UniProtKB/Swiss-Prot annotation, chain B:
Induction: Activated by 4-aminophenylmercuric acetate and phorbol ester. Up-regulated by ARHGEF4, SPATA13 and APC via the JNK signaling pathway in colorectal tumor cells. The keyword Plastid does not apply. GO terms for molecular function: collagen binding; endopeptidase activity; identical protein binding; metalloendopeptidase activity; metallopeptidase activity; peptidase activity; serine-type endopeptidase activity; zinc ion binding. Glycans are attached at N11, N18. GO terms for cellular component: collagen-containing extracellular matrix; extracellular exosome; extracellular region; extracellular space; ficolin-1-rich granule lumen; tertiary granule lumen. It is linked to Intervertebral disc disease: A common musculo-skeletal disorder caused by degeneration of intervertebral disks of the lumbar spine. It results in low-back pain and unilateral leg pain. Ca(2+) 2 binds at D56, G88, Q90, D92. This is Matrix metalloproteinase-9. It comes from Homo sapiens (Human). Belongs to the peptidase M10A family. In the arthritis patient this enzyme might contribute to the pathogenesis of joint destruction and might constitute a useful marker of disease status.
Length: 155, 159
């Protein structure tokens, strides 16, 4: 299951109260940049519901039939490629979002993982691969050779 | 802002007078605490957070002219400044809030790394000549351990 076009679009519907708009826009862009670096895909920011990947921050019940569970636990979730809600990525705003070393969760790293799913990737079994199902902070290049092979296999 | 005195006690106290609007107070408290930890790890010094003006190191975020006689210059340029050990304003650290404060890779400047540098001055350290050193006068983002051997030797020499 994957996208049939390579010029993918995204829409940042809203923001979190934890960080400045500029920091959030940048974090999402750098996250998309990791993937386009190893594939023929490109990512374009738009401002309408016509975008392939719609990004949203929410708490508890927020629309779909999948409410978040308050602080900690599930950090976020996304859907596989397709029309409508498919391909979208949502982030639990009951979590403390930040960047780098320190308390709170890295928005940059979590976004990179969520976008992996929105592109068609599944969970990895390599505990050190980005697509590994459990959160873990890391410095340096985020994508493990397992992630790179997985995306290249699809696109 | 380059004196020649050190602190005569090792139980240093600090007070976070106010905050920046760019990050949650919890993220800021944590960033400052981790910054001080860098230095207490390689010396016999300790740092205690207090809530009165009687603290040795008072931390403040300001815009343009903010009290002393050295106003900030708006976005970019001078990021922050601190004063050498001593009484009153001496030892304090000020951050320019016209800057976009953040953490890690990305746009904006790392509050963590800049604080580490300012606290170095607040402890008595001068500027280094080694490009890789934290006390180097130019801002540069880096991952991994912030303190260079030059910084470690410099602090141990005083304390
Ligand atoms: C601290 N919580 C977790 O690690 C949590 N896992 C998640 O929230 C996953 C995303 C992280 C790896 C970025 C959920 N996910 O698979 C999203 O697509 C659990 C407590 C292990 C469930
Ligand atoms: C981006 N701006 C700079 O690198 C700026 N340097 C500073 O503001 C120094 C602090 C940085 C290294 C955290 C000022 N300082 O030495 C304070 O004690 C210059 C453009 C190089 C002046
Ligand atoms: Ca949660
Ligand atoms: Ca969609
Ligand atoms: Ca939040
Ligand atoms: Ca952090
Ligand atoms: Ca400035
Ligand atoms: Ca003082
Ligand atoms: Ca600011
Ligand atoms: Ca950053
Ligand atoms: Zn959802
Ligand atoms: Zn996942
Ligand atoms: Zn000042
Ligand atoms: Zn300096």
């Amino acid at each position: 299951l994957k996208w049939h076009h390579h010029n993918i679009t995204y829409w940042i519907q809203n923001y979190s109260e934890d960080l400045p708009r500029a920091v959030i826009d940048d974090a999402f862009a750098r996250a998309f940049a990791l993937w386009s670096a190893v594939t023929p895909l490109t990512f374009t920011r738009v401002y309408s519901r016509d975008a392939d990947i719609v990004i949203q921050f929410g708490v508890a019940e927020h629309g779909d039939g999948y409410p978040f569970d308050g602080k900690d636990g599930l950090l976020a979730h996304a859907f596989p490629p397709g029309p409508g809600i498919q391909g979208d990525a949502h982030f639990d705003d009951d979590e403390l979002w930040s960047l780098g070393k320190g308390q709170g969760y890295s928005l940059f790293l979590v976004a990179a993982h969520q976008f992996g799913h929105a592109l068609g990737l599944d969970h990895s079994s390599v505990p050190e691969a980005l697509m590994y199902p459990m959160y873990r902070f890391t410095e340096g290049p985020p994508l493990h050779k397992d992630d790179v092979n997985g995306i290249r296999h699809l696109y």
